[PDB]
Amino acid sequence: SSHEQFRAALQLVVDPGDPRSYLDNFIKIGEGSTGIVCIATVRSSGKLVAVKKMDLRKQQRRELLFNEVVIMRDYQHENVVEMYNSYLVGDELWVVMEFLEGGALTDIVTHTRMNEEQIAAVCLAVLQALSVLHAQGVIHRDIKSDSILLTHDGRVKLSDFGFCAQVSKEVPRRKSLVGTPYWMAPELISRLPYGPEVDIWSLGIMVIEMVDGEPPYFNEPPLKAMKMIRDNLPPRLKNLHKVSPSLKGFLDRLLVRDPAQRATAAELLKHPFLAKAGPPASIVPLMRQNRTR
Numbered sequence: 001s002s003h004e005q006f007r008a009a010l011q012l013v014v015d016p017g018d019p020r021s022y023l024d025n026f027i028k029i030g031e032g033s034t035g036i037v038c039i040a041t042v043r044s045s046g047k048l049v050a051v052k053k054m055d056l057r058k059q060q061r062r063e064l065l066f067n068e069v070v071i072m073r074d075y076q077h078e079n080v081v082e083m084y085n086s087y088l089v090g091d092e093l094w095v096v097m098e099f100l101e102g103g104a105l106t107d108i109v110t111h112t113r114m115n116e117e118q119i120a121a122v123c124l125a126v127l128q129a130l131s132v133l134h135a136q137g138v139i140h141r142d143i144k145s146d147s148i149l150l151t152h153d154g155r156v157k158l159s160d161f162g163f164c165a166q167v168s169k170e171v172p173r174r175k176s177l178v179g180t181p182y183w184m185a186p187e188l189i190s191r192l193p194y195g196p197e198v199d200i201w202s203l204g205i206m207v208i209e210m211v212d213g214e215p216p217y218f219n220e221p222p223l224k225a226m227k228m229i230r231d232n233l234p235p236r237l238k239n240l241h242k243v244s245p246s247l248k249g250f251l252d253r254l255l256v257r258d259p260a261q262r263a264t265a266a267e268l269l270k271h272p273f274l275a276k277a278g279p280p281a282s283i284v285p286l287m288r289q290n291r292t293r
């Protein structure tokens, strides 16, 4: 199909009109591999929103742009960032989202040590979201610290659904090479049909982020990191001797090469490691000060 055909199809899927009719003060605040995010203000109320802008021409696989705007429309969950509206503006898809004033987990893991009360809190929030999404056949496919956002009071919400997918009884597995190389599950890199289990592996890589500060193989070329994830034993914590046996045991249920033996989100919510999870207040110090690893 041509670019004009794709644009016309996406136009039928999004909300009509131009959101510049009610938004002001577009300022870029961050980016992903598929586009940028701006803060903006609703002109009549002063409400702050985040606007993701993705150029229809600059996508590796532009049909992925259908997925979030359809799958996640009207989705409501305590631990999921809200999508308000979506629009076509020129050759860009704009998705108007909830603004999460605490920013991304990435800026925490690069600036401070996290204790296990805080790591368990983050894991519990993400698994509460994933258990509900996976039960509806939604695979996130891009779990990583960049995808976890915080409120100023320390609540945790999952974002970055641009790569998500839908499985069903009729189409129970995906086969697309989708995600971020260092976090990708080995069966996904292997081009095997896969399901929600890939999110659990990615969550395990994010635990390594929270313990060590970076995922495995992070200054390796991405194609080389992907080969090592596919071919090597599951990656290991740099700070292995610093974590509790409970954390190690939890991680050992995530970084399981065989997806059939990997724990599910619902199974993980029962794990004793998550009994350590602190309340939102336990997370707030991570946004206000830095403590070295």
Ligand SMILES: O=C1Nc2ccc(C(=O)N[C@H](CO)c3ccccc3)cc2/C1=C(\c1ccccc1)c1ncc[nH]1
Residues within 6 Å of the ligand: 029, 030, 031, 032, 033, 034, 035, 036, 037, 050, 052, 053, 054, 081, 097, 098, 099, 100, 101, 102, 103, 104, 146, 147, 149, 159, 160, 161, 162
């Ligand atoms: O308030 C915020 N509400 C959101 C709603 C959704 C997303 C999101 O999906 N971002 C991914 C990258 O993670 C993405 C961006 C562009 C194209 C494709 C994916 C981000 C935010 C969001 C962000 C933000 C923006 C860019 C990168 C990381 C965090 C934010 N930073 C500081 C305070 N708040």
